Amino acid sequence: MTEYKLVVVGADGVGKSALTIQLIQNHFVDEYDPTIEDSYRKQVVIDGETCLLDILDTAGQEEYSAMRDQYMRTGEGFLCVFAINNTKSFEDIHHYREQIKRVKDSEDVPMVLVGNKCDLPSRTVDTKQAQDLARSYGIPFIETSAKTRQGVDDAFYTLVREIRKHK
Amino acid sequence: MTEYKLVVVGADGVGKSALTIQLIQNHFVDEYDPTIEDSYRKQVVIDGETCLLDILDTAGQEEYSAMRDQYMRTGEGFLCVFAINNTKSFEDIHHYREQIKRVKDSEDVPMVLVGNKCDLPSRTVDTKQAQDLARSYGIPFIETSAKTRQGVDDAFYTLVREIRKHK
Ligand SMILES: O=C1N[C@H](c2c(CNCCCCCCNCc3[nH]c4ccccc4c3[C@H]3NC(=O)c4ccc(O)cc43)[nH]c3ccccc23)c2cc(O)ccc21
Ligand SMILES: Nc1nc2c(ncn2[C@@H]2O[C@H](COP(=O)(O)OP(=O)(O)CP(=O)(O)O)[C@@H](O)[C@H]2O)c(=O)[nH]1
Ligand SMILES: Nc1nc2c(ncn2[C@@H]2O[C@H](COP(=O)(O)OP(=O)(O)CP(=O)(O)O)[C@@H](O)[C@H]2O)c(=O)[nH]1
Ligand SMILES: [Mg+2]
Ligand SMILES: [Mg+2]
């Protein structure tokens, strides 16, 4: 058995909690209830290895920069989430990646860029634009929908694979 | 901590959803997606008190006005929204205010008159005209733009202050 500390980060309302709740509880959260900080455990098998995922579901906006830095130091891998209908959340990605790199004092940190709400037709961030950004960061990119469950398992499992590769 | 049940009402397309989404998610929705009924939570500090805002984003549908009675009974305060480029929506305000007063069986219901889309130069409702009407209603008036965020926080916070005053 191996434990993996995963952190889900991103702007207000991108679907951080809905993505995590889909992985843990296998259903969609339709309601909008802002997160302060929650954590969840999930035991899963990834590439034949027994994994205990310890997932931190973070707030869109931190109250204390120093409190935020602590989970970035502890976290082994980061799911950097934006919503495909929210250009501000996509532009905010750089700020999350820069904060993670600074706290970890490393240019190489396991990360996955997640483009959530891909079920929505009202797209403002194109697929190629997110693919190019992820290519420039040297990280995988996955489109997800916490509503339909599209790409949810793949986003978390890819992050675990990135952590296992880094180790 | 205190919870406040806020209701955003007004005619079709005045920007009820865009105002609420700007308040909580800090981005402007350019798309027009008609609302059936959505609710959102937002934790804020107003005059030193932590407020958990429970905001109901309602439909602009003019048909079956009786469908509004239950949320009008439950709601503690109302954001009565019109668009500054839509004279019909400004004239419709009276119908929303009359229904609220009837359902609540009170002339002193916490309300704020909101003149949305103030970023638009194609104005048909003058600021002074809405100020004059709001004064005759005995309620505050705030101009807002879900696009620029002008007056968005002030509209919701003023409504909370009106509910507190009423208590
Ligand atoms: O004040 C505190 N609240 C905290 C707390 C919570 C968390 N709550 C989170 C919001 C929950 C929204 C629930 C959907 N609320 C949805 C909602 N939002 C509205 C806004 C306006 C009008 C109606 C609604 C409605 C709907 N409700 C109706 O009756 C209705 C009718 C017609 C409609 O069409 C729509 C609606 N749960 C607790 C249980 C016990 C004690 C405290 C709490 C708390 C903790 C604490 O340490 C100290 C103080 C507090
Ligand atoms: N259409 C659609 N809606 C989604 C998707 N993911 C989340 N949502 C919706 O977006 C809203 C916010 O989702 P939530 O998971 O709370 O986002 P969050 O980023 O955790 C909010 P906070 O930053 O305050 O913790 C909810 O109404 C939820 O149903 C998705 O993939 N598609
Ligand atoms: N320029 C400008 N456009 C706005 C503003 N607020 C809303 N809009 C635009 O008006 C249209 C309708 O916005 P929306 O928030 O859906 O209005 P609504 O009142 O919730 C519509 P419904 O009654 O069906 O729920 C959208 O195209 C939106 O971009 C604003 O402050 N400025
Ligand atoms: Mg959340
Ligand atoms: Mg709407």
Structure determination technique employed: X-ray
**Strand pairing report for B2-10 and B77-83:** parallel
Domain harbouring B88, CATH code: 3.40.50.300
CB proximity A89 to B under 8 Å: yes
**Rounded Cα–Cα distance for residues B111 and B96 (Å):** 11
Site from B1, B26, B56 to mutate, A interface, most A CB atoms within 10 angstroms: B26
What is the resolution of the experimental data for this entry, in Å? Answer: 1.6
* CA A46 to each of CA A1, A4, A136, A162: distance values in angstroms, whole numbers, following the listed order: 11, 12, 27, 12
- For the record, the structure tokens of B136 come out as 């005759």
* Interface contact flag, A86 B25, Cβ < 8 Å: yes
Question: What range does the domain containing B54 cover?
Answer: 2-166
Those of residues 28-87 in B touching chain A at CB distance below 8 A are: 29-31, 33, 38-43
* Interface contact flag, A32 B43, Cβ < 8 Å: no
Degrees to nearest 5, angle at CA A85 with A81 and A91: 55
End-to-end CA distance of chain B: 15
Give the number of domains in chain A: 1
For residue B59, which amino acid is it?
A
**Rounded Cα–Cα distance for residues B142 and B127 (Å):** 9
* CA B27 to each of CA A86, A152, B30, B38, B86: distance values in angstroms, whole numbers, following the listed order: 7, 25, 9, 17, 23
**Rounded Cα–Cα distance for residues B39 and A167 (Å):** 43
Regarding the beta carbon of A58 and ligand 2, being less than 6 Å apart is answered: no
**Rounded Cα–Cα distance for residues B133 and B54 (Å):** 28
**Rounded Cα–Cα distance for residues A95 and A80 (Å):** 10
Ordered DSSP codes for B34-92:
--SEEEEEEEEEETTEEEEEEEEEE----S-GGGGHHHHHH-SEEEEEEETT-HHHHHH
